[PDB]
Each structure stands twice: as structure tokens, then as C-alpha cells.
């Protein structure tokens, strides 16, 4: 497989400060293409990537309506959830959801997703079969019983196997110049003396897309997983990502270290070393 479409929805209650804010952002891999925010002066589904803009007026209308209705559904869900947990009307709470599909290079469904988390803890998820649910506790079991009764999984499955895979295929075609393009990382190794005894070797990967990457340091061909400092892959702001991995090495031993870089935009993985 090679592509995924996903929607990240966050509904957060704020007693005393209005109705729960609902925001939904849509992504194709690591490219956000839409956002809907109930807090926008005029909430509507809005392009966040050039290739979705060409979509017609009815596209925006239909999705805007789907999002306004989801805002309401998630508000009622937060009410229900407060009750399931015997929580007061005074506290603030968050209901999050992620839904979407993964398709192979040929565009065939690899797998579908539809899961929720309440206050940061997993709550309920549609299983990979796209037919049953896994509830995390007794409150989620209530949601499960209701979903089973209304045959909700069938609806999500039909969306995940049809509509989601079809839109993803259309998006991929309309934005093939970027969505289908992997940008390899630009790599280099820097060296920062810590003392007369040790120095840090930092291996950089910049300008890469998608975010998926693996940077590792080896001393004498042995992975230094426990001794490597790895920062979380971060966005540069231009669609690309950055990441570094560092290792503290004894002065004079820098050549025994090699940095290994794996990225899909690289034909063969790279091996680099500090080059004075």
C-alpha cells in the first residue's frame, strides 16, 4: 500500500463559554486538504490545498452540511458521554475521532478506520473487519449496543469501502504532482564538541515528504538505539519535514559512527558519517 485519507475531528465542551467547539481537518497522507471549524465566523468546509479547490460548488455545500451535522452529532455525543461517566456539567471534555481508508498503489482498499477517544483515552473503534466494534469500557459498551442496534457499522463500512476509497483515488489523481511525489531528505552530519572528551554527532534529514522516515546511528555497525537522541519529526511549513538523531561520542571515535537514513523517496537507504 501507499496512500491514506483521514479525517481528524475534535469536539471540546467549554461550559460557560458556549457550545462545544467542533473542528474537522482532512488529510491525504501528510497533506491537509480541508478544515471545518464551528468557531469560524461562517463555518463551512474550506480548501487547505490547491488541488481540492477545483472541486465544484456542490462539493463544498455537501461537505459543509456533513460537517455542520457532525458538529451537532458530536455535541449530543459529548452530552451522552458526560452521562455515561456520571460527570458534572461543569467540566470541559474532548471527544476525538479519526476515520478514513488506506489504499494500495493500485488504489485497492488495504483497510478502513473509524475510532473515537474520550478525554484522550480510547473509547470505541470499528474493527478491521468493518463489521464489529471494540469498546474500551462499560460506557463504550452502551455506544456499542446502540450502534449494533442501528446497524451503524454497515454505514461506516459502505463509506470506507466505497466513498472514501473513491474520493481518495480522485484526490490522488487531481494532486498527483505533489501527493504522488516523495521528496527525499537532504542529509548531513554536524559535530558539536561537548567537552575535550565527548562531542555530539547530529544527523539531519531535511525537506522530506512524506513524514515517514527512520534515522539511526550505529557505532561499529551496531545500532545505538538506547544511546541515540531522536527528536520527533517536525513540519518545516512548506509541506516538508525535518528530523534529527544525535549521539554523544568520545573524541577521536567519530569515524566509528554511521548514520542510516531510510525514506521512501530514497532508492537505496543512505549511510553517512561526520565529514570534517
Amino acid at each position: 500500500g501507499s496512500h491514506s485519507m483521514r479525517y481528524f475531528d475534535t469536539a471540546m465542551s467549554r461550559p460557560g463559554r458556549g457550545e462545544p467547539r467542533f473542528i474537522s481537518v482532512g488529510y491525504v497522507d501528510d497533506t491537509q486538504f480541508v478544515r471545518f471549524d464551528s468557531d469560524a465566523a461562517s463555518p463551512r468546509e474550506e480548501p487547505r490545498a490547491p488541488w481540492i479547490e477545483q472541486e465544484g460548488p456542490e462539493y463544498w455545500d455537501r461537505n459543509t452540511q456533513i460537517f455542520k451535522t457532525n458538529t451537532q452529532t458530536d455535541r449530543e455525543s459529548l452530552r451522552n458521554l458526560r452521562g455515561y461517566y456520571n460527570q458534572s456539567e461543569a467540566g470541559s471534555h474532548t471527544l476525538q475521532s479519526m476515520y478514513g481508508c488506506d489504499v494500495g498503489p493500485d488504489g485497492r482498499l488495504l483497510r478502513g478506520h473509524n475510532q473515537y477517544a474520550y478525554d484522550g483515552k480510547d473509547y470505541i473503534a470499528l474493527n478491521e473487519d468493518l463489521r464489529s466494534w471494540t469498546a474500551a469500557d462499560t460506557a463504550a459498551q452502551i455506544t456499542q449496543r446502540k450502534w449494533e442496534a442501528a446497524r451503524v457499522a454497515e454505514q461506516d463500512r459502505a463509506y470506507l469501502e466505497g466513498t472514501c476509497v473513491e474520493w481518495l483515488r480522485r484526490y490522488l489523481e487531481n494532486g498527483k504532482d505533489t501527493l504522488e511525489r516523495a521528496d527525499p531528505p537532504k542529509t548531513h552530519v554536524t559535530h558539536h564538541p561537548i567537552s575535550d572528551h565527548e562531542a555530539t554527532l547530529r544527523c539531519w534529514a531535511l525537506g522530506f515528504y512524506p513524514a515517514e522516515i527512520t534515522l539511526t546511528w550505529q557505532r561499529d555497525g551496531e545500532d545505538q538505539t538506547q544511546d541515540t537522541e531522536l527528536v520527533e519529526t517536525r513540519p518545516a511549513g512548506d509541506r516538508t519535514f525535518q528530523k534529527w538523531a544525535a549521539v554523544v561520542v568520545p573524541s577521536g571515535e567519530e569515524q566509528r559512527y554511521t548514520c542510516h537514513v531510510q525514506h521512501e523517496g530514497l532508492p537505496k537507504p543512505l549511510t553517512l558519517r561526520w565529514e570534517p
Binding site: I66, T73, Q155
Partner: peptide
């Protein structure tokens, strides 16, 4: 394209 969500 978005999905119709159901009440939990």
C-alpha cells in the same frame, strides 16, 4: 469527502 457521524 466527509462521513456522516452517529451519536455515541
Amino acid at each position: 469527502g466527509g462521513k456522516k457521524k452517529y451519536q455515541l
